[PDB]
Swiss-Prot record, chains A, B:
Tissue expression as described in the entry: According to PubMed:11956595, ubiquitously expressed. According to PubMed:12011995, expressed specifically in testis and ovary.
Family, as annotated: Belongs to the Vang family.
Species for this entry: Homo sapiens
UniProt-recorded name of the protein: Vang-like protein 1
Residues represented out of the complete protein: 263 to 505 of 524
Segments on the Cytoplasmic side according to the record's topology features: 1-231
Length: 231, 231
């Protein structure tokens, strides 16, 4: 991500970066890191001009080998698309059932809207299997909890949102602030920089914002002297 | 292949099988055998209830591994189709050039048809690269020789055949008799059978026709007693 700041201290710039991180950066997912580590561990489990020649020959031989990553990525994308379509159909059917239940409850009592909580309770099992399958295939089951899903469904029922709005929240990972408060931690943040944090921003300085299992590297650059002429 | 024979000796049945082999069976291609051996040699290079359990677990783990064969076979089929289309286009252009040359030679002298040999000489380089690429991708370069290709082109010019007829000879492997005489050997054939070859055919007897690098196993069965009734 890129941001524009003024004459500020290193600590102030780090705080601005942190506050923009929640609403800008995608939520951190350790599942991708675990998958990458599992993929990389195979090479470790299997195991200076001459060494350079040998590694160059090994790389050349590998370049002619089978491209295992591409086909499995394509299969994963196809499975994700199929499960997304199934989840969309299930959510549409659930919303149809919600509309039918509201219409039925309309005749029972006029001017007395039903509480959405019981409607969410009755409707959730219909799409529960599809939502769980989509979360499993997208590695998003940890963030989305059953109570959170029920609360979001009730909120959508109160607002009368379209099924697409409900679907898109669980479609892809988004900002940190979308999930619950306990998901993010604002206490373990640390600042690492060779220069003192009391000094102002300078061209070429680089600092790091550390936190549990992940760090953000911030590079500071000076805007070039723009020269404008009337043709 | 399946054939129907009468009361014949083992030698006569083997001779009938051999004479039908040339006009029925596809030409033997050792390139596929070499490819299969190269694929199988990787397992050798890499390397009783407990052993059975271990091999069953290994097979189960392999069943969940990547299907390398399918994607590479699909890529090979796509490449073969693309090269086939390119060869078809090249042969069509070559036949157009042949027709143009014949039309040009018509005005030079009436009633004196040109010899097809020089036309084949002039036309072969146009499609030579495409034909060589197709033979390389189909592992058929050994059987089809340059002189044989020229002779086939001259024969087609004399008969005025369509480009499809010329293409289909090199399209896929066919009968043994299509290629040159030196391709097939009718001297190294041998007969292997536990029973004496002088005896007649009997149900359940099996024999082998051996030849250089390849053998044909022949199984003999008796036609079942068919009972027919008028409803
Ligand atoms: C005759 C009298 C009126 C003279 C008064 C002198 C002031 C104009 C000087 C004396 C002390 C100076 C301050 C001493 C230390 C600091 C901290 C210093 O902090 C930094 O370098 C980090 C912040 C940044 O990046 O600007 C910024 C300048 C400042 C406010 C100075 C601003 C100018 C001050 C007030
Ligand atoms: C009073 C006179 C007229 C009696 C004559 C007797 C013949 C009717 C017999 C005597 C020798 C026999 C032959 C002896 C040996 C052979 C070889 C034998 O060969 C096999 O078993 C392999 C071929 C096959 O599968 O039939 C077949 C029967 C045959 C021709 C026999 C056929 C019947 C023959 C001519």
């Amino acid at each position: 991500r890129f941001y524009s700041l003024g004459h500020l201290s290193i600590q102030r710039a780090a705080l601005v970066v942190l506050e923009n991180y929640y609403k800008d950066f995608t939520i951190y997912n350790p599942n991708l890191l675990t998958a990458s580590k599992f993929r990389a561990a195979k090479h470790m489990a299997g195991l200076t001009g001459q060494s350079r020649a040998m590694i160059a020959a090994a790389a050349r031989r590998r370049d002619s080998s089978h491209n295992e990553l591409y086909y499995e990525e394509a299969e994963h994308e196809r499975r994700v698309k199929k499960r997304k379509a199934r989840l969309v159909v299930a959510v549409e059917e659930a919303f149809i059932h919600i509309q039918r239940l509201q219409a039925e409850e309309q005749q029972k009592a006029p001017g007395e809207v039903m509480d959405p909580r019981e409607a969410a309770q009755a409707i959730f099992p219909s799409m529960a299997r599809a939502l769980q399958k989509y979360l499993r295939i997208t590695r998003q089951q940890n963030y989305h909890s059953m109570e959170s899903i029920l609360q979001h469904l009730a909120f959508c029922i109160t607002n009368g949102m379209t099924p697409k709005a409900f679907l898109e929240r669980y479609l892809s990972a988004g900002p940190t602030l979308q999930y619950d408060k306990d998901r993010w931690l604002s206490t373990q943040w640390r600042l690492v920089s060779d220069e003192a944090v009391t000094n102002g921003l300078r061209d070429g300085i680089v600092f790091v914002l550390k936190c549990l299992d992940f760090s953000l590297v911030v590079n500071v650059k000076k805007i070039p002297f723009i020269i404008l002429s009337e043709e």
